[PDB]
Structures are given as C-alpha cells and as structure tokens.
Amino acid sequence: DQLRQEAEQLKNQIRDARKACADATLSQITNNIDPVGRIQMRTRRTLRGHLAKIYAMHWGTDSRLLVSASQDGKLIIWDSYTTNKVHAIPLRSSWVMTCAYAPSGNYVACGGLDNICSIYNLKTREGNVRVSRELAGHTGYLSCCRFLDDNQIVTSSGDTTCALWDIETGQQTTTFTGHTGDVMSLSLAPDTRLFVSGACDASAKLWDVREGMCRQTFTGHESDINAICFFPNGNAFATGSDDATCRLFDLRADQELMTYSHDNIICGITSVSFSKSGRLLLAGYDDFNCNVWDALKADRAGVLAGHDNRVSCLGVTDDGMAVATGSWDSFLKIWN
Amino acid sequence: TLSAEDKAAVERSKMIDRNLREDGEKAAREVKLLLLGTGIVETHFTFKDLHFKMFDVERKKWIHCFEGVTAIIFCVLFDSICNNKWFTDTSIILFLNKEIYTHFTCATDTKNVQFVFDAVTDVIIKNNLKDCGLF
C-alpha cells in the first residue's frame, strides 16, 4: 500500500509535465491549410471467393499480392491487379483473427483462437504451401501478428502480452509486460525499431524490440482500442476505439495531439490506416462504410460506401496506389 | 491475344475456385454449436448426415467472433447474454442435471442427442421460412 502513494505522486507529476508542452493544438495550428476537398474513390476490383466473414488482410510489400483470412479456415493469396488466386492455404482450425504477409514475400503467418501462430512457406520446392513452423507459448487468443524484416515475428495475444519470436528456432526471445487487458492491436514501425500495442484498457503503449523496455504510455480513450497504425514518418500514430473516436498521438510529445469524432456514428471503429503522404486517415467503422478522414483538419473528405456489412480489415499499399477493405460479407474490394 | 502466361495462371485460379466451392459445400451441410457455462477444444460426431461440430470455449470480446453459430448450449446471467446484440437471433438450449429450450437429462445418451437434434432442426426451419419471404 505504501507504493500506492508513490505511484500517485508519480502519475500526477507525469501528467503535469505533459501539460507543460501543451502550448497549442493542431486544429488551431493548421487552420490555414487548404482542405483537400471532396475525395471520391470507386471500387476498381472486387475480389470474391470467400464463404464467410473476412477477419484480416495484409498487403505484400510489392503492392500487388494480397492475403486474406476468413472463418472458412482458408487463407487466399490474391493477385489484386487481375483478381486471380495465387494460393489457397487450408487451416487446421477455422478460428483466425489475424494474418500477415512477410515483407520478402516468402512466408505468410496467421493465428487466432487456437493460441497458435502458424508460419506458412509460400516459395518452396514442389509448389505446395506447408506449415514451416507452429509457434506456441501464448495463453490466449492471438490478436495481431506482424513480420519483422529479419524473419522474426512479433505477436500480441489475449493474455495481455506481446512476444517476439524466432522462426528459425521457435521460442520466444522477448515479452511485453504492463498491459492490464487483452491486447487487440499492434503496429510495427517503418524502420522496425519500435512498435505500439493497444489493449482493452484504453491505453496504447510503446515498446522497443532491441532491449525490451516500455518507452511511453498514452491514454485518453474511454473503451477498448481495436486498431492502430503509424504515421508514415514513424513519429506519430492513430488509434481506433469502441467509442467512435480516432485519436492521433505523437511519440516525441508524449501527449494526445488530435481527435477525429463524429456524433453521427455511435458504433466503434475496427480499422485505422494512413495514406502514403499521411494526409488521409482512413477508418473502418461498424456502420458498414469507411470514413476517409483528414489527418490535419478532422473533417470528413469522403466515404467508401459499398460494403453490405461492417469493415473488419483495411490496408493501404506501400506505394499508396490503392486501398483494400474486407467486410463480414465475405468480399474484398480494392478502392482507389 | 492479350494473355500469354496469364491464360495458364487464370486456369489455375479457376481450379482453386472449384476447390473452394466443393469444400464450401461441406461447411453449408453442417451445424456449429457453442457451449457456454490451452486453446479451443472441438468434438466432432456424426448424426444421420449431420456432422455435428460441438466446440467449447475482456471475456466480452469473444462474442463477436462466435456470432452466427446455430445455437448455444448450457449445461447446469442467461438473460444478459440473450440481449447483447450478437446472440439475439440465436436459439439457446439448456440441459438440466430466440426459442429457449429446456430438457431434463436422462441416463440414455440417445434420448439426449435426439432432443438436441430436433432443436437444431426447427431453428433451421425458422431460418428457412424467414428467408423464403413467409415470415
């Protein structure tokens, strides 16, 4: 109980320090920025072939190959340019909540309620996709999954921890600690030196994969965090909550920077992604349509209406040439 | 023409499309059952062409993923679960030891299995009629 007083004496000190740098707000600093204007995008391609809800999706670094996982227990590697199917990987358990496509394109990972992250080998002999490894060690639903360039995978499970594995050996080499709830979101850095995880505590922490220390910790949300993504330069990130309030934080300022709220939506947010230049902040709400926000004005710039169910996944290619979304209607659509 | 190898690639895509449909038929001819009250445990048993797939399970975040299951089984709070915007349109089966069904367990295994099989049928009937423009 003695340490409780010290913790209170520390949290208030941190709160006061953050307020010291609070000299203005982005909504007032960039009032002279010309609005981007109405942005209209048409569904160029409509990939179909899934027979259940689509829970995850990831873009290959080449910006052409697209993976997707659904409740059918089948990953599909799409060719976005021609809508062709490159692979169809069957899964041992049809409970998948995430997927990742390796930066080099050799491997693809997935996982879910089985508490197992399976690494599949795409480019191999005999033209057959087989489970290269079966990572185990978590104690809860595997929430998110991302590949580091060195073929070492970072996972975030429902046991309130995030681990860094070694595909070659198959055992954890690091472990987040500090979250007080299920970790639902995870986002690497462009340089892969840092990453952030959002949990069911209205808190988003920052981690270092090199030595394993919690650098910052951002609060301000009122409910769980269901998605996170970095600004292209890697000095800021945006998170999506269940109270329909996307918030943009800054790493160097250690304080919330801007908020994107619209009372017309009362349902939560299920995906957040930035554009190549970082001016656009796409968001996938549960109202069955996306909302292409403005990263600097908090004013809507369009909507990607055209989904019959909620938008559960949302990703933007590396070159920014397209946007893909996958709703529970079992349909992926490439916008632009 | 406009395609040289893409014709071969398109042929491969059409072969994958078929495999999804053929295996997609098996999923349609199946009923998923969730039991409430490491990993996930699954129990598969056939019953007159119904390959019943009965599987058993912060804690409120696991309900979005299980939505769509045919029914929920209780073996023994129930009011709150029924009005969570997820299982509102899902039947609940309760064993003693949205059309809520209650049955007293019996020593014979066939009788218990018979009751649950019937409970799945009618809920399937209701879905069919609702999808047939009748109710």
């Epitope: 062709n84 394109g105 002999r125 | 071969a8 690639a9």
Partner: single-chain antibody, 232 residues
C-alpha cells in the same frame, strides 16, 4: 524430388509406342507438364503440353494429330502415346514440369530422359554463335535474337535461359529479365530488351561449360534457339 521416365528403344518406323514418366517427391496434380525432344545433333524442340487438371492441351505442328498426351494424377504418371513414327521422330525425350502463377518459375525441373530410336513459320529464335573457346576466370556474354518482340503489354519479357551440361538434362538458369532461378550462382545475369537479349557469366568456373539454350514463352508453340556452346 525426381522426375524419371522409362521406355524408348528401337521401334519399327510407322508403328506406335508409349512413353511414361513417373513423378515422385512433389505434388504432381498441381503442376503443368511439358514434353521436349532433342534430336541427336540438332537441339531442343517442343513436343506437347498438358495443363494442370488436363484443362488444355497443345501440340507442336510437326507432331499434331498422331501424338497424344495423358495425365493420371492419382498415380502420378505422365503418358505420351506415340503413333505413326517416322525417321525424324528419333530423339532424346525429356519430361519437364512448369507451374504457372504470378511470380512462379516454370520449366524449373527437367526429367532425366528416355532414348527413342526409329530404324531407317510463326516465331523463330536464332543464336548467331557457335562453340566459343573460353578459359576459366574471364567473363562471357551470349547473344540471342528473336523474330518478334518478346515484351508484353503487362511488362513481362518471356525469355528463358537453359544450360545443358554434358550428359545431363538442361537446367533452368534465368526465366525472365534478370530473374535468377533457385540454386543458381549469382554469377549468371540476364538483360536485354525487345528482340535483343544477352546472358552474362561473371567469373566463369569449370562446371559452367556446356550448351546454353534460349526459349520464348510468349506464345505456343515454344521454340528454342540454336544452342550456343562453350569450350574450355
């Protein structure tokens, strides 16, 4: 992974013969299959092709009608029913696999070969070169020419470079512009555009001696080059 075929031997001209290839170590049902003959002293020549799942079949003009190709996935066997043999049908027959999807490497693995002996216009590719004497350690460049432009509207230049070491089936080196095959040293490099193509070898080693063939996959029938050869 082996692709071994059996059959061959002397056959009365005008008769029929059956050539079978047994595939083990890889998923046969998911691969396309090609037949390529090689006359004793002329070079490689395309024969026939059967897609994955017997979707489509293509035959060379010189052997259209009297040749049939069949595929039996459950037993992993490829059959070439040969009918009305003639003097020029004699050749060393190879069985080649090729999987077609975005980013794949078709013609990667070649069979071993069965020797078949018979007792007594649209796309042309030329290699204006012959046996080039070369010593180890010096770079070598091999030229190639195409009647048509192999570049396509989608940006893929369908040229494949094969190497046939003495006494062994040809091995894939490069399948497109600078697209090295698996298990090939970095020394080899590919380049060129349009109808002009070149293959460069850096720090040539002893094992690199052989015959280099150029093939186009832009449109059937597939046609090989003159097979430039290297002398140590």
């Amino acid at each position: 992974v082996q692709l071994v075929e059996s059959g061959g031997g002397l056959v009365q001209p005008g008769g029929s013969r059956k050539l079978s290839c047994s595939a083990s170590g890889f998923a046969f049902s998911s691969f396309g299959m090609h037949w390529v003959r090689q006359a004793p002293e002329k070079g490689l020549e395309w024969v026939a092709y059967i897609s994955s799942g017997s979707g489509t079949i293509y035959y060379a003009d010189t052997v259209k009608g009297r040749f049939t190709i069949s595929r039996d996935d459950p037993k992993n066997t490829l059959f070439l029913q040969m009918t009305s043999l003639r003097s020029e049908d004699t050749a060393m027959y190879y069985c080649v696999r090729s999987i077609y999807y975005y980013g794949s490497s078709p013609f990667d693995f070649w069979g071993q070969g069965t020797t078949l002996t018979v007792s007594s216009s649209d796309i042309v590719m030329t290699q204006a070169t012959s046996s080039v004497p070369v010593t180890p350690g010096e770079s070598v460049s091999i030229s190639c020419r195409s009647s048509k432009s192999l570049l396509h509207s989608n940006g893929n230049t369908y040229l494949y470079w094969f190497l046939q070491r003495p006494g062994q089936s040809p091995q894939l080196l490069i399948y497109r512009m600078s697209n090295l095959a698996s298990g090939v040293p970095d020394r080899f490099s590919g380049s060129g555009s349009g109808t002009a193509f070149t293959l460069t070898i850096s720090r040539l080693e002893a094992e690199d001696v052989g015959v280099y063939y150029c093939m186009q996959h832009l449109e059937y029938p597939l046609t090989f080059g003159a097979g430039t050869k290297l002398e140590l």
